[PDB]
RNA sequence: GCCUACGGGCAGGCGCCGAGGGUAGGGCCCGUGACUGGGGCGAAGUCGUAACAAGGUAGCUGUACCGGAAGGUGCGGCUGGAU
RNA sequence: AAAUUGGAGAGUUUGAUCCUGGCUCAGGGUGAACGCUGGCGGCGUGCCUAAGACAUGCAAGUCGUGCGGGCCGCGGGGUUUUACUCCGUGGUCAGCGGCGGACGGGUGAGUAACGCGUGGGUGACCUACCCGGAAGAGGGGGACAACCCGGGGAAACUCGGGCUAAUCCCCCAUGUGGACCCGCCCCUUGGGGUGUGUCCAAAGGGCUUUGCCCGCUUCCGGAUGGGCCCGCGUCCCAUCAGCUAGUUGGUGGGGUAAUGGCCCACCAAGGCGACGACGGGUAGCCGGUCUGAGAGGAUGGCCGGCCACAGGGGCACUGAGACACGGGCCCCACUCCUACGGGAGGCAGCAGUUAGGAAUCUUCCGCAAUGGGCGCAAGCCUGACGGAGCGACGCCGCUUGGAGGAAGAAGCCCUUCGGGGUGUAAACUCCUGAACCCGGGACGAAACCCCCGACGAGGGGACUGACGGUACCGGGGUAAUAGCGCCGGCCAACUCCGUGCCAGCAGCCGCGGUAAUACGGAGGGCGCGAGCGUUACCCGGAUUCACUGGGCGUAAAGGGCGUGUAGGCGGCCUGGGGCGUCCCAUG
């Protein structure tokens, strides 16, 4: 099943993520389909989380279950929100 | 002196000597049974045949159903054996029972 | 066949030593050198220059 | 480490003066004052005539001495120098100019470069009201280099800053004196460094 | 696009089957003169209907036998012997060439 | 022989393919090696003095024969042969 | 692969000279090793050899919300000799069953191949779990473990009998739908539709029980991951020139998810090769990396992509997926147990042992993070991974001080005995304050969950750190490692002494036979600096394989001469085609 997760591309005691769309089955740093954003768990930098919304919309509309901290991290960027009455 | 021991990977083993045997029992079935079968058009037998030919015909879907063929290699030999059958009642006469056969 | 280089060795019948590349023009059929300060080769004594090209040791007080 | 030894004596092998040292080399001691041929027994006796390496070797030499800096450091630098858009030969000066270490000397915190590093290292410097010491920590422009508060006493810094009284910082500087602060301009134009280097000769040595 | 060469028959001897010359040039990868290498397919005729001298364009195929991976896929230009005598002769040249022996 | 709803299934038995082995007979590649060919060398001696001067019989060359060897001669060829 | 951003040579054949030409050096690089030396940190990186042998420990499990039961107990009940027996429950063990075990991890033996790269094909195909859409889950019966009973074996294990539960197995029905034969319509390789005949489904569990959650069934599409096929590219030897008989094609049949000599039977005599077949050698391939002005050469650990193997060789079984490293069956070689009938084992997973070798690490910490498996969740597992350790193995950063200080102490060295040199160097004066001491002290971690809200959005709440008392901050605070090569020319750096063709140096030319700037020591100098040298190897220099960019009268080099095959190349005008070629757009 295709998920939605994170992919260290730091240092040692630098982590530096990125999230992905992959292949369950593939290694953590492996060939992903899509990169959507990435994410810096330290915030070194006033911008430590992007998302782009409407291909993680598009990725999830076709069941790309995401882990958990990838729930979050999207959620965070408000993939899920929806508004109004 | 001791072979260390992996419960839940002999236990698979234990479950596929299982499963092998019923897959063999399934698919026999159908060989010896669809071998009935095209042998009794052979003699011009269509009360007989197609009453056979569709006993065949279920146990092959069967066996589909379940994991001891895919669908279509069930269905591959649905094509086999039907065909086969019509194809032996030219050399004699008319397919009496309709059966699993259609014109 | 391997040059023993240095002022004067410690070398016999069965030293154990180790070789590495450099010819001797002067000696034919020679390609090879005796390292110096391993297995049982000593270093030169008292040399005091080229020291690691010879194994010797830096001594004190000098 | 970096180079720790006699120095008014490189001062002499390079046959100008360098200061290196800082309260005499202005004075009538730097021994170019004294003794302006090269260092050792042979000193005294008559030139050969130098090879193109000989020439283009010293001249590097001369300009790194000048700075502090390993050759290791200084090769990377030239090499830096050499992958940027721009004159090398200047661009390299002013890579060099951007140094820590001499920007507070420049800066006229410190009698000499070689004082300097000792500011920078043992903490004395203020980088954006943070501390450096790092003495290759590359200023950049709009860079603020102040004293430590904790440092603004020593008898140095104070009586370094009232020989500012009658000098006056680089064109690419400034100097706010009372408050003990200084900001780097812009970078050096070839032309504010007036050192007695012909740039170019080091370009043609690292080109062999 | 399933791939389309265009070439020439110079085998009939094949039940249902022709073997197609088929030329390429391109400049060559260090010394860039224009070089003319050539190759030979396997085609399947379901009808016998090419014949030996035939100009035949050939198409990328779902696989036949063990070397036919190719349909004939239309006739170019029929009769054309010249081109199959260059490789009949390039041929028999062959037989030369050796080493157990020549004659007279 | 076992199970059965009597349709058939299971054990078992045979057969092809088959890793591997057996006999014979070839071909190939490395390890060691009795006995051997010259060869290049490398210290300055033996006996010659062929070549370099027309080198004291112009030189070289293919092919022969002689000679342990250097060379000699025969038959041609060449000038890269001196007055 | 967006300023034309880029290009150095020297020594050596001669008495001298010009050319030819080989040799050699300076540069850059390394998964390095060896010598002398070795203070600190950060990030990388570390068996290149025997794909040799491997002790020990761990490396893939999980679910009690699919199902029954053994052992050890706890409660709480009903009851015929006070033994039985009903219910709930803790702990533990395995079994039946589902899912994972085909991913993740190692290695580079084999392979010169559709293996890889690159672009395409699939009307010749499969795809568990995930997503969307449509439809359904109605009856009936059945077997094997566990368990109890009994027999063989030294062991490993093993056969027999009897009981039984399920989301396990099996038959009947409804069939939205699908599968198969046959016919028609469109389409065109086996694609889509349609009509009669046949044939095919299903399972239950949990609770906050008159409806929610998890799971089940058939089918259509998405999504992702693979099979197969084709064009083009893919090292050396022609002192390997012919190779081939399942070989090449056909027809039919088997097998597969599917094409195919992939397999089998019968028929035909084909298939490939000088554009290098076949044979021998060597090698995993690439994104890249090293070098180079480029072109080119060289290389493919570490990261990522594909492949291949799991002690050698076969083979299939389970299954969505394997012909499966820690699954199965057989043969061989090896090692161990053995009662000599027989059995056990597979680190090229992490760490380590051992051999081999010039040479390559800790039997460490942690599941806090990311990722993976199983589960409703809590959680379980995870030598993937996150970290620490050891090694200057590499790069980078830091230190061993800073300022003042003599016409210039001593000692050592040279001296023409006047003096010169180390040398502001030292001493000595002030200043700073690595080390270290005390105090504070991280980010990485907020979700899973629980509560409100609807189970959604959204809001509130709690748990969780291996690194690590680390980084970092504040205060205090000591002058506090320097070594290695070199100094005849290339090539930065010169004197004395000893030695006497000796000892020795030597990359090359050469040096040394009593005045040695070349041996050895010393003073002095040059070059780098926690490093410096050496050896090995790649590229460079080497327009010295010359595409860029070379040659052949005498330097190495024109076939002894012709004939002519394949091939290479080819006049002037006009017109078509547009293959090469060129331009644009797009992938
Ligand atoms: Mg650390
Ligand atoms: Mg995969
Ligand atoms: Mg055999
Ligand atoms: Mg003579
Ligand atoms: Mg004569
Ligand atoms: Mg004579
Ligand atoms: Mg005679
Ligand atoms: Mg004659
Ligand atoms: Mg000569
Ligand atoms: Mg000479
Ligand atoms: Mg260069
Ligand atoms: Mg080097
Ligand atoms: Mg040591
Ligand atoms: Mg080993
Ligand atoms: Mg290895
Ligand atoms: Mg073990
Ligand atoms: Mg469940
Ligand atoms: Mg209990
Ligand atoms: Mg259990
Ligand atoms: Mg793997
Ligand atoms: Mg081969
Ligand atoms: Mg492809
Ligand atoms: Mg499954
Ligand atoms: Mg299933
Ligand atoms: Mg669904
Ligand atoms: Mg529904
Ligand atoms: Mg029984
Ligand atoms: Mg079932
Ligand atoms: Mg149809
Ligand atoms: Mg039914
Ligand atoms: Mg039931
Ligand atoms: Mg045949
Ligand atoms: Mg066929
Ligand atoms: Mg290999
Ligand atoms: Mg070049
Ligand atoms: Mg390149
Ligand atoms: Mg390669
Ligand atoms: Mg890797
Ligand atoms: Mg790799
Ligand atoms: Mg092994
Ligand atoms: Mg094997
Ligand atoms: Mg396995
Ligand atoms: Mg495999
Ligand atoms: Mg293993
Ligand atoms: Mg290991
Ligand atoms: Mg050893
Ligand atoms: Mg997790
Ligand atoms: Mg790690
Ligand atoms: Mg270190
Ligand atoms: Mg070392
Ligand atoms: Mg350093
Ligand atoms: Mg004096
Ligand atoms: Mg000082
Ligand atoms: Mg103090
Ligand atoms: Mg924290
Ligand atoms: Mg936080
Ligand atoms: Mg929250
Ligand atoms: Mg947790
Ligand atoms: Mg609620
Ligand atoms: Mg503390
Ligand atoms: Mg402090
Ligand atoms: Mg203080
Ligand atoms: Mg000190
Ligand atoms: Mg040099
Ligand atoms: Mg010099
Ligand atoms: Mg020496
Ligand atoms: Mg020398
Ligand atoms: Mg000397
Ligand atoms: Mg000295
Ligand atoms: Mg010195
Ligand atoms: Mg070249
Ligand atoms: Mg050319
Ligand atoms: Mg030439
Ligand atoms: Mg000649
Ligand atoms: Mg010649
Ligand atoms: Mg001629
Ligand atoms: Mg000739
Ligand atoms: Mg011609
Ligand atoms: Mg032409
Ligand atoms: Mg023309
Ligand atoms: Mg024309
Ligand atoms: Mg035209
Ligand atoms: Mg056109
Ligand atoms: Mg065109
Ligand atoms: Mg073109
Ligand atoms: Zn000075």
Redesign the pocket.
Known sequence: ???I????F??????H?RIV???????????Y?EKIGYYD???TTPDWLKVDVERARYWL?????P??????LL??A?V????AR | ?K??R????????????????????????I???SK?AIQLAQEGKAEEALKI???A??????A?????????????????????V?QLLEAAGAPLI?????? | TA?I?????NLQEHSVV?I?????????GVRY?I????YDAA?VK?????????????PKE? | ?????????????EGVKLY??????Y?P?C?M???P?????????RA?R?????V???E??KLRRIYGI????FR?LFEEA?K?????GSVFLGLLESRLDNVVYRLGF??????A???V????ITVNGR?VD???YRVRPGDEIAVAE??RN???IRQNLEAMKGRKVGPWLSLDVEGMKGKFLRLPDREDLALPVNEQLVI??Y?? | ???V?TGVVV?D?????V?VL??????H??????????????A?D?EEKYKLGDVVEII????????????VLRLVESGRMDLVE?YL???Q???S????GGKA
Request: with cysteine; net charge positive.
């Open positions: 099943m295709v998920k997760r994170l992919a260290r730091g240092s040692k005691h630098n982590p993520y769309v992959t292949d369950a089955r593939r290694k953590r740093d492996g060939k389909i768990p330290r915030k509309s076709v069941g790309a279950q882990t958990d901290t990838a729930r979050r959620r965070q408000g899920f929100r929806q508004e | 002196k072979p260390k992996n419960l839940s990977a002999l236990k698979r083993h234990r479950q596929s000597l299982k499963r092998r045997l019923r897959n063999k029992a399934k698919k026999s079935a060989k010896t049974l009935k030919m569709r006993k015909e279920s146990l092959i879907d069967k589909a159903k379940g994991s001891t063929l895919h669908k279509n290699a069930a269905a591959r030999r649905k094509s086999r054996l039907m065909r086969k019509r309709g059966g699993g056969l259609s014109a | 040059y280089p240095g002022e004067g060795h180790l590495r590349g450099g010819r001797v023009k002067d000696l034919p050198h390292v110096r300060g391993v270093g008292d040399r005091k220059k080229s020291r690691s090209k010879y194994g010797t040791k830096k000098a | 480490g970096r180079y720790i030894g006699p120095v008014c004596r490189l001062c002499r092998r290196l040292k800082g309260e005499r080399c004075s001691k021994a004052e004294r003794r041929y090269p260092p050792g027994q042979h000193g005294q006796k050969r130098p090879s193109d390496y000989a283009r070797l010293r590097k030499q390993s050759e290791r450091q990377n050499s940027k858009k721009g004159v090398t410190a009698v000499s470069r070689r004082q590093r000792q500011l290292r043992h903490g004395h501390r790092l003495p290759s904790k440092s020593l008898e140095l043609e040595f080109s062999r | 696009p399933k791939k060469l085998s001897k094949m039940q249902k089957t073997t088929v030329e390429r040039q391109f400049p990868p260090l010394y860039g003169k224009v070089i003319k290498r050539s190759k030979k397919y396997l399947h379901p990328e195929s779902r696989p036949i036998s063990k070397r036919k991976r190719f349909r260059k002769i390039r041929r040249n062959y037989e060439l050796s080493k157990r």
